[PDB]
Structures are given as structure tokens and as C-alpha cells.
Amino acid sequence: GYVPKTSLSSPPWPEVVLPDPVEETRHHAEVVKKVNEMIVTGQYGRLFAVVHFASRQWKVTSEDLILIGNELDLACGERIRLEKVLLVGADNFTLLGKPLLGKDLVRVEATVIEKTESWPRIIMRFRKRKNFKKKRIVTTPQTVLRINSIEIAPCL
Amino acid sequence: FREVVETTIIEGRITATPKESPNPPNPSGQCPICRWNLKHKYNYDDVLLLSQFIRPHGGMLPRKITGLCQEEHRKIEECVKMAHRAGLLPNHRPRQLNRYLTRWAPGSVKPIYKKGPRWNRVRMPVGSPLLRDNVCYSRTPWKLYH
Amino acid sequence: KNKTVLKKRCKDCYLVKRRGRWYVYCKTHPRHKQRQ
Amino acid sequence: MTGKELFEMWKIINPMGLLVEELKKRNVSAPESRLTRQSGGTTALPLYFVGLYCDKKLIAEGPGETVLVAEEEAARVALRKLYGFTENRRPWNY
Amino acid sequence: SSFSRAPQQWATFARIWYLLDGKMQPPGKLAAMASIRLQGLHKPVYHALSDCGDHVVIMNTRHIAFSGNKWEQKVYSSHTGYPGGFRQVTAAQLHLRDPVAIVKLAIYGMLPKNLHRRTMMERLHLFPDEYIPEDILKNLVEELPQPRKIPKRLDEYTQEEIDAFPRLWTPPEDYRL
Amino acid sequence: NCNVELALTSDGRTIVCYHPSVDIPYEHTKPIPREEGPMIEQLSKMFFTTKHRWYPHGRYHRCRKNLNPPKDR
RNA sequence: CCUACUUCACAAAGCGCCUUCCCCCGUAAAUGAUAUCAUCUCAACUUAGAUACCCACACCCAAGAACAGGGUU
Numbered sequence A: 001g002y003v004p005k006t007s008l009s010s011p012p013w014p015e016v017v018l019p020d021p022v023e024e025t026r027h028h029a030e031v032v033k034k035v036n037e038m039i040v041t042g043q044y045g046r047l048f049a050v051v052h053f054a055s056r057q058w059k060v061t062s063e064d065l066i067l068i069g070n071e072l073d074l075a076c077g078e079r080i081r082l083e084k085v086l087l088v089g090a091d092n093f094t095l096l097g098k099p100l101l102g103k104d105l106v107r108v109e110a111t112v113i114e115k116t117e118s119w120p121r122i123i124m125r126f127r128k129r130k131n132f133k134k135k136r137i138v139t140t141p142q143t144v145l146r147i148n149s150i151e152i153a154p155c156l
Numbered sequence B: 001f002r003e004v005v006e007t008t009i010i011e012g013r014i015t016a017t018p019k020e021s022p023n024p025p026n027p028s029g030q031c032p033i034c035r036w037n038l039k040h041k042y043n044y045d046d047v048l049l050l051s052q053f054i055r056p057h058g059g060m061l062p063r064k065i066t067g068l069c070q071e072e073h074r075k076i077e078e079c080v081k082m083a084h085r086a087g088l089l090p091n092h093r094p095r096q097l098n099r100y101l102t103r104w105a106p107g108s109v110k111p112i113y114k115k116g117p118r119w120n121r122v123r124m125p126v127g128s129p130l131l132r133d134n135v136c137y138s139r140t141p142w143k144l145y146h
Numbered sequence C: 001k002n003k004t005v006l007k008k009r010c011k012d013c014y015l016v017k018r019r020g021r022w023y024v025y026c027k028t029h030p031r032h033k034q035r036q
Numbered sequence D: 001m002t003g004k005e006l007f008e009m010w011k012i013i014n015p016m017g018l019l020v021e022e023l024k025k026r027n028v029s030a031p032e033s034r035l036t037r038q039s040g041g042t043t044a045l046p047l048y049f050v051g052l053y054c055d056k057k058l059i060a061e062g063p064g065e066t067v068l069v070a071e072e073e074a075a076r077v078a079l080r081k082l083y084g085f086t087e088n089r090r091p092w093n094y
Numbered sequence E: 001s002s003f004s005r006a007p008q009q010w011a012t013f014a015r016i017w018y019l020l021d022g023k024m025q026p027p028g029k030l031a032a033m034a035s036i037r038l039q040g041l042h043k044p045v046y047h048a049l050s051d052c053g054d055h056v057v058i059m060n061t062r063h064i065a066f067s068g069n070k071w072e073q074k075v076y077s078s079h080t081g082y083p084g085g086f087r088q089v090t091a092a093q094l095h096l097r098d099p100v101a102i103v104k105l106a107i108y109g110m111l112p113k114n115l116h117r118r119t120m121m122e123r124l125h126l127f128p129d130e131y132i133p134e135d136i137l138k139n140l141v142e143e144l145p146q147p148r149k150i151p152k153r154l155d156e157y158t159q160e161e162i163d164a165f166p167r168l169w170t171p172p173e174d175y176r177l
Numbered sequence F: 001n002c003n004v005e006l007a008l009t010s011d012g013r014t015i016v017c018y019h020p021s022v023d024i025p026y027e028h029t030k031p032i033p034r035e036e037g038p039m040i041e042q043l044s045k046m047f048f049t050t051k052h053r054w055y056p057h058g059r060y061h062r063c064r065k066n067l068n069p070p071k072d073r
Numbered sequence G: 001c002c003u004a005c006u007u008c009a010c011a012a013a014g015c016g017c018c019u020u021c022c023c024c025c026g027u028a029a030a031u032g033a034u035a036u037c038a039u040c041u042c043a044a045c046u047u048a049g050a051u052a053c054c055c056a057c058a059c060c061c062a063a064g065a066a067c068a069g070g071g072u073u
């Protein structure tokens, strides 16, 4: 079983030993207590959050804009609570979920500002030597949201 | 070992034999490579394992004396060749371009003036294929031909 | 003489690998001399 | 003021003087400048990171094309930090 | 964070000088590290048009080590356009003439084959010795770790290392050597 | 580099990462110290680029360049 | 390149005169192991084994299609 130290005995990636679960749960309790005691006192600055809206995830900071390629059937200026938050970070901690953070923990709220068309997008097909040539113009519907609040609850 | 001291009087004197380290972790094997669990666990690099099996003028010891398997003797023989040509056993000289893993002898390879098409390329051999059985700590295996 | 497969034809003929080629060298009859 | 940096809004000249005075009010000694990082220093495109320190520990640091520019810009960074108007300040609670 | 616009941009994009010792190393692991750092592929700011590449200072490139019979079997071919100007030289002859050319040709091949390639090849400084000019030593920032772990010989082993390795076999007492 | 303190909350539906910002120690710091062709060679060797970047270009090419482009952020 | 000869004649030429500088590798050896002899060794090894050239208006020119180059003390 014992092997002398040659070139290829112990593989070149470093050997790390996993800590036992008892002191590691002690460690996790210490870390979660630190981070929650930061959150209860507001020891953070401003927050960002990766948020899985329409079909794709946005990295959202408060007070900003998000253009979404569909019409959301909401009157303009209307507040929305963007559920499916899936990372929330600050200057000194982050909280990522598996995959989603709970609704009891993070609230992200936005509005609907404007409900536009896009620019005309030309769809031309052409096949050569064959008199095949078609043209279409597609104006897609787009709605622009402004994200107001990223507020975080100290429920850990 | 014994030495032949000459001066005219010539004599043969046995002087100071080493001996094996006490406990082989897997005894009742055949070759000393088996008895210490090193069947597929060395390279050309390691010059202690290679340097134990070598005449003090760089040549390698016969099978019937050192007691190897045939396979591990050929492997250690090729590893000695590749450790000498890289410059890793400098004390074992018979009495400047830098290499390693040279399969073939340096002054006897004709250069590749026509590497072929891609479907029949002439490649540059690297290392030896007698070490094809080592441990693979990689997903992409040893490219033995370059 | 280039033989793609080397024979031997006396006692004294001996196969040696030099310069990447197998050769048959002989001393009594140097006519045996071959090359891969 | 959303997204406007402070010294886009409060235009000052001689920022190190304001910093040195502001540390005189907080009963803190004068800041020592220390060239933390640097690159390309003898070429046309340098990068000096200069840190402002107060008693063995740094209050701020900032980058720049020359040492004087990086120095005064670290002073501005620390001035943003002292007043509390950083780029990660808590956003306005509307 | 909390820099001004011009210094934040200047901190982000401005280029870094990387030393890279080339002793005992093959010219393609040197070329692979140096090609990545010349293009800018080690930055999360990387864009193709961004012109974000860094500076690379490869030293000791006389002591390169091709991994095998490459030193005799690798051929570098060029053709001065005159009829009969086809010149093939092995890596050894090319290395003896100009002892920088192998790493430079390796790096030149690695890089993408567009018009940025000769901008990039000017950020690269190759020196064949340990000697590097002083105006370049004052710019260096990081010395990149060598890509081939250099194995050491019998002479460089300590006494404790030799004592730790067991002797695997008993030789017979009556033996000549 | 990485020095972070990773944890789960007790149930195991979140992962909390604690990463403070580490400052540079004082000991790790230095004190502050207190023709046309040959033109293009001098500028090229100053800025480590090829000559072609500094050669001028036509009125037609200079006339497609946008001089009121959009800024952001 | 033009001192002669020759076509020729303030030049250009040959038919005339001058100068022209170093290596090729395939084999033959010695020491020598795997294989304690031996063996040239796709074993470690030891023999036979690039300088030159270049390089800060006008008028006439041995420079020249033009431009360029040279000279004008």
C-alpha cells in the first residue's frame, strides 16, 4: 500500500483534506450568524441581484433599466415584484440560492415605463440561380422596465 | 561488489555490498518493482529508482542479476536511455541542446523534409511507448507522437 | 546491398542496428554486407 | 444626481489640501502616500496605484497615468469615502 | 470602486508587463502562455477589437528544450521568392543562427492570423540570455510560473531525499561492476 | 487568489458567501520617488505598435466617421 | 574595363585585357553496456567532422527616358 515518492505516485493536483462535518457546521453557523447580523443592521451599501425575468437572467442593480422583448400586458408605470431572484450580492457578502432564493428573503421591485415597438427588422431570404427572393419586415414588441428596489430581509 | 585492484600485482577484493531496505510492502513478488508497489508508477524523471539499477559508467545491469521481469527490465532500460539523453544522470559518464523524452538516439534521426498530407503525416516520436501503462492523471492521454 | 528483409548466410554474419538501420556485417566474406 | 460622481457635482481643486484639513478635524495625523502598484513605469503608458495611509493602514488608494495624478486621485477617493458618498452608497430610498 | 471615469478606465485597460523565464522549457508551452497573454485572453475585459493585450518578456531562450528528437527532426521551411531559394533548416541550425527564432516562430504561429498579429508581436520582447535591458526591468510586474516542472538530476538531490528512497534490491556479493 | 468563507443556511436552500475586502499592507508598498518616416518609427517604438497605425487616411474614410456617437453609463 | 590590337575615334565595343574566396555525411574507426566475451552507440560516448559591398534658380556632367544622382572654388 505504501508507495515511495516517485514522479507519478501522488498525482500533481494538490491534496486537500475535507474537514469533518461537526466543526464545519460550526463554521457555517458562524458565517451565517455574521452575515445575518450584517443584514439586520444594514452594514451593506447597495445591492445587485441576478433575476430570471422573461426568459433570461439580468444582473440588476437598483434604479435602472431593462428592455424585454415581449408585451407584458401591464399598464404603464405599474409596479411589479420580480420573483425568481437567484443571486443577491453586496460589497461584503453574497447570497446565492439553489437555484432560487426564497421570496421571504429578497424583494426586487420594478415598474413598467414604456411599451414600444422595436425598430423595423428586415428578414430577407435569397437563393441564387433560382429566382428565389423574399422580403419581410418585422417590428417586434418591447417593454422597458425600471427597477426600483432591491430590498433584503434578514431571514436566514 | 568486487573490484580488481592492479599495480605488477593484480587482485580481486569484495568490498562493501549494500542490501535491500528491510520491509517490502508487497513481498513474495518476483521483480523488485513489484515488491515495493511501483509497477506503473515511475517515469524517466525519477533518477533514484533509475540510478539504483545502473553500472557506475551509465550502462544497465543484466536481468539475471538484478532480477527484473522482462517487461519492467525493458521499461527501466528505456527510461535509463531517456534519462541519460536529457542530462539527468551526470555522475554516470563514460569516463549543447536541451532535451527530454528522446525516444531515439540524437545524432541518428533524419529530419522531416516532407511532413506528409494530413491523412498520412510523418510525426515526431516523443517519449517511449513502453510507458503506455503508467497511471493517467489526465483525460487527454500521453500524446506519444508529435 | 539493400535488402528489405535481411537473411544471413554464414556464422560470421551478425545483425547490428546502427544509424537507424539494421545491417548485416561479416568479416570472413564482406560480400554478405547488407542494409535495410 | 443618480449616477453622477461627487466631484462632477462639487468641483474642487487641490483635493489633498481638503483631505489633510478634513483629517485635522477628525484628530488624525497627516496622510502618508505610498506607491502600492505600478506598471510600464518607464514607458508611454504607465500605471501607478498610489495609496493614502494613516498610521500604518490605508484610508484609500487610486490609479493613474503618473504619480501626481494617481496621488491626487487617491486623495479624491478617500474624500469620497470620508464623507460617505461612495459609489456603493445606499441608493436613495424613494 | 469609487474612482473617477478616466482613472477607472485607465486602471482597467492599461497593460502589464510579464516576465517569463524560458530555461529548460519547451517553446510551445512558453508560446501558449505568451500567446494567451499577448492577445489579452487572460483578462475578463477581453474583446477582440479592444486592443487589451499585455507585454511579455521571455528570457533565457537559448536554453529551450524540445521534447525529444524535435531538435533534429523538426524542420523550419522558408522560401525567398527567387527560384531555388527554398531553405529548410532543422531546429538546431535555426537555433544556432539566431537563438531567439524558435520561440518567436512558435508564438507567431499560435496567434490568430489577422492584422493584429504584428501589433502583438511587437509587445513581445525576447532575450536569449539572462541579460535584459534596464529600461525593461523597471516595467515588469509578475513573473509567470514556468509551464514545465524542471526535473532535477542526481547531483541536486539532498541527503535526506536519497536516504528516504529505499534500495529495492540486493545485488549478489560477488559481482564485478 | 481566493479567501472567502462559504456556508449554507441550515435548511440548505441558499449559499451564503462572506467576502470582505482585504487592504494592502503598509509593508508591501514603496515610497513615492521625489521628418515623417522617422516620426513614425519614433512613435511606433514609443507605443509598441506597427507603422501602419500612424499612416493617414483618405477624405472618404475620414468622412464616414461618426463624430456625435452615443455614449452610455 | 579601354593602355594597346581590332570596329572605331572627344565615346561606345570584342574579336581584346583584368578578377573570381570555404564545407556537403555516406561510411570507416576506438572505449563500451542491455547480453559482465564481443558490438561504430535509433545505449550513455570519442574521432575523420563569412567575410566583403552599402551606411552624414540655372548651367554642365563619365548620372539620366521623365524624375532622380553628381559637379559649379
Ligand SMILES: [Zn+2]
Pocket: B029, B030, B031, B032, B033, B034, B069
Ligand atoms: Zn514483477
